[PDB]
Design a protein around this ligand. Structure first.
Ligand SMILES: *[C@@H]1O[C@H](CO)[C@@H](O[C@@H]2O[C@H](CO)[C@@H](O)[C@H](O)[C@@H]2O)[C@H](O)[C@H]1NC(C)=O
Ligand SMILES: O=C(O)[C@@H]1O[C@H](O)[C@H](OS(=O)(=O)O)[C@@H](O)[C@H]1O
Ligand SMILES: *[C@@H]1O[C@H](CO)[C@@H](O)[C@H](O)[C@H]1NC(C)=O
Ligand SMILES: *[C@@H]1O[C@H](CO)[C@@H](O)[C@H](O)[C@H]1NC(C)=O
Ligand SMILES: *[C@@H]1O[C@H](CO)[C@@H](O)[C@H](O)[C@H]1NC(C)=O
Ligand SMILES: *[C@@H]1O[C@H](CO)[C@@H](O)[C@H](O)[C@H]1NC(C)=O
Ligand SMILES: *[C@@H]1O[C@H](CO)[C@@H](O)[C@H](O)[C@H]1NC(C)=O
Ligand SMILES: *[C@@H]1O[C@H](CO)[C@@H](O)[C@H](O)[C@H]1NC(C)=O
Length: 431
């Protein structure tokens, strides 16, 4: 079973917003943070309630050695939507993104459209002074800002008070881009023959005091108390491996725009001159960076979203645009920093007697959020009758991009690959 008693969080759950060292400074940040004094649910164990996930979750736990392994994320937690899994097995982790089926207790039996996994050093550290009284308190913070699942942690012992209220910062451990939809949240247990602290983050403005050593000593909220609000107001590397752009441009089944195959590029040397050779460029509209000055810049990560679309939709693809593709199929974010590449390909998307392999979505319940995929076949509703049967007033969502060797250029196949560069203060992986 379990219990759902409520307690107070006090001044707890503040993590270094960036990776920028600061000294004798009173830097003010706006991001997701756990509100000061803000209602954290303390649970027990002796079944395992699936907790809602929104705007990140603050998770703390006090245990003897180990009874909590990891966490599960995703939506509907079934074999119809991709899901996460972060079990800290033994002295390592097991992070992965896969459409997990079920276990109802080997935590999954899914080996389908999965892979896309990330392993790393274990997130569980325990030390004892020859005695078990050293009940170290493990605090974690997770968030899913436009994917890029972020994870923060900090282990601190000498827990003489239930949920110490003293200040404690949180250091990041790993930042892997899952790029999925997360709404639910669940936790794993262990075996044997008082923990589960859970708080939710909300968008707040924090004012943080930084020590000369960079350690965050004190922080004050700016939306909690009149005094707090007033106080707030007054306050290239050793790489030679050429990037796989070759395959990116030498693929044969650049997917349809309804499933934009995103390709992450890292640990490589990006000489775009090869990118200039596998494509008589018809459109090289770069927004965040000048294409001439691309060989003197270092990007922490590069994303190569590849999809073939029609001619007008090439002009459609741009930051802040409109159309049946820019709303329901692929929406580039407004502050895009990257390049779009669209050369012609009427030799691989054509044949006599025709071809209709490709696809696109004219019918979605809402607009597509920036960099989000929506692969699903649901009949669009009309009137007040939910169909899923197909016909008038009952429409299938995606209609075909049937390509043939003889259309006008406005209808001719256009191979589009869009590069999303990362120009932000962080370890440079691509140069
Ligand atoms: C910031 O860094 C200083 C230089 O390392 C710290 O001073 C030291 O403190 C350690 C023990 O904490 C001593 O062993 C050493 O001799 C020296 O005095 C200083 O404490 C630290 N300030 C912090 C962590 O707030
Ligand atoms: O090896 C890499 O760098 C990348 O690892 C993972 C990425 O998945 S992605 O969904 O993210 O693109 C792949 O594209 C590749
Ligand atoms: C906060 O916790 C108190 C004590 O259990 C409870 O009465 C109150 O309703 C909680 N507020 C919210 C919004 O959860
Ligand atoms: C946990 O599972 C991962 C799966 O890749 C494995 O690499 C790791 O070695 C395991 N943990 C251990 C044995 O410490
Ligand atoms: C994987 O997804 C494709 C469509 O994207 C679907 O046809 C296929 O059945 C899926 N496989 C599984 C079971 O994950
Ligand atoms: C994440 O989950 C919801 C429900 O599954 C889904 O509609 C959407 O992709 C995400 N949330 C919203 C409303 O943006
Ligand atoms: C490259 O190797 C040299 C020699 O070992 C080392 O000093 C340097 O720090 C390395 N650079 C990077 C970015 O790893
Ligand atoms: C792909 O094939 C070879 C490399 O295998 C290359 O010469 C050719 O230009 C490539 N074609 C395109 C369109 O990228």
């Amino acid at each position: 079973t379990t219990t759902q008693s409520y307690t107070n969080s006090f001044t707890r759950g503040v993590y270094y917003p960036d990776k920028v060292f600061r000294s004798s400074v009173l830097h003010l940040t706006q991001d997701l943070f756990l509100p000061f004094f803000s209602n954290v649910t303390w649970f027990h164990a002796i079944d395992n309630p699936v907790l809602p996930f929104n705007d990140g979750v603050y998770f703390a736990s006090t245990e003897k050695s180990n009874i909590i392994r990891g966490w599960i994320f995703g939506t509907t937690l079934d074999s119809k939507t991709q899901s996460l899994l972060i079990v800290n097995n033994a002295t390592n982790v097991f992070i992965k993104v896969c459409e997990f089926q079920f276990c109802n207790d080997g935590v999954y039996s899914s080996a389908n459209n999965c892979t896309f996994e990330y392993v790393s050093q274990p997130f569980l550290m325990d030390l004892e002074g020859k005695q078990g009284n050293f009940k170290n308190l493990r605090e974690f913070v997770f968030k899913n800002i436009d994917g890029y699942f972020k994870i923060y942690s900090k282990h601190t012992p000498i827990i003489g008070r239930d949920f110490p209220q003293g200040f404690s910062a949180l250091e990041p451990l790993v930042d892997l881009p899952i790029g999925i939809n997360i709404t639910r949240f669940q936790t794993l247990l262990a075996l044997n023959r008082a923990d589960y602290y859970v708080g939710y983050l909300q968008p707040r403005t924090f004012l943080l005091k930084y020590n000369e050593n960079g350690t965050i000593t004190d922080a004050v909220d700016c939306a909690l108390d009149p005094l707090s609000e007033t106080k707030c107001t007054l306050k290239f590397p050793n790489v030679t491996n050429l990037c796989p752009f070759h395959e990116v441009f030498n693929a044969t089944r650049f997917a349809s725009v309804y499933a934009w195959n995103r390709k992450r590029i890292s640990n490589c040397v990006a000489d775009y001159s090869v990118l200039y050779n596998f494509a008589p460029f018809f459109a090289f509209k770069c927004y965040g960076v000048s294409p001439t000055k691309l060989n003197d810049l270092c990007f922490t990560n590069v994303y190569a979203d590849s999809f073939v679309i029609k001619g007008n939709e090439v002009s459609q693809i741009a930051p802040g645009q409109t159309g049946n593709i820019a709303d329901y199929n692929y929406k580039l974010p407004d502050d895009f920093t990257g390049c779009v590449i669209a050369w012609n390909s009427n030799k691989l998307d054509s044949k006599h007697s025709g071809n209709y392999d490709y696809w696109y979505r004219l019918f979605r319940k809402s607009k597509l959020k920036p960099f989000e995929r929506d692969i699903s076949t649901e009949i669009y509703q009309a009137g007040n009758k939910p169909c899923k049967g197909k016909g008038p007033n009952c429409y299938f969502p995606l209609q075909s991009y049937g390509f043939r060797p003889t259309y006008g250029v406005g209808h001719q196949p256009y191979r589009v690959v869009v590069l999303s560069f990362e120009l932000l203060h962080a370890p440079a992986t691509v140069c």
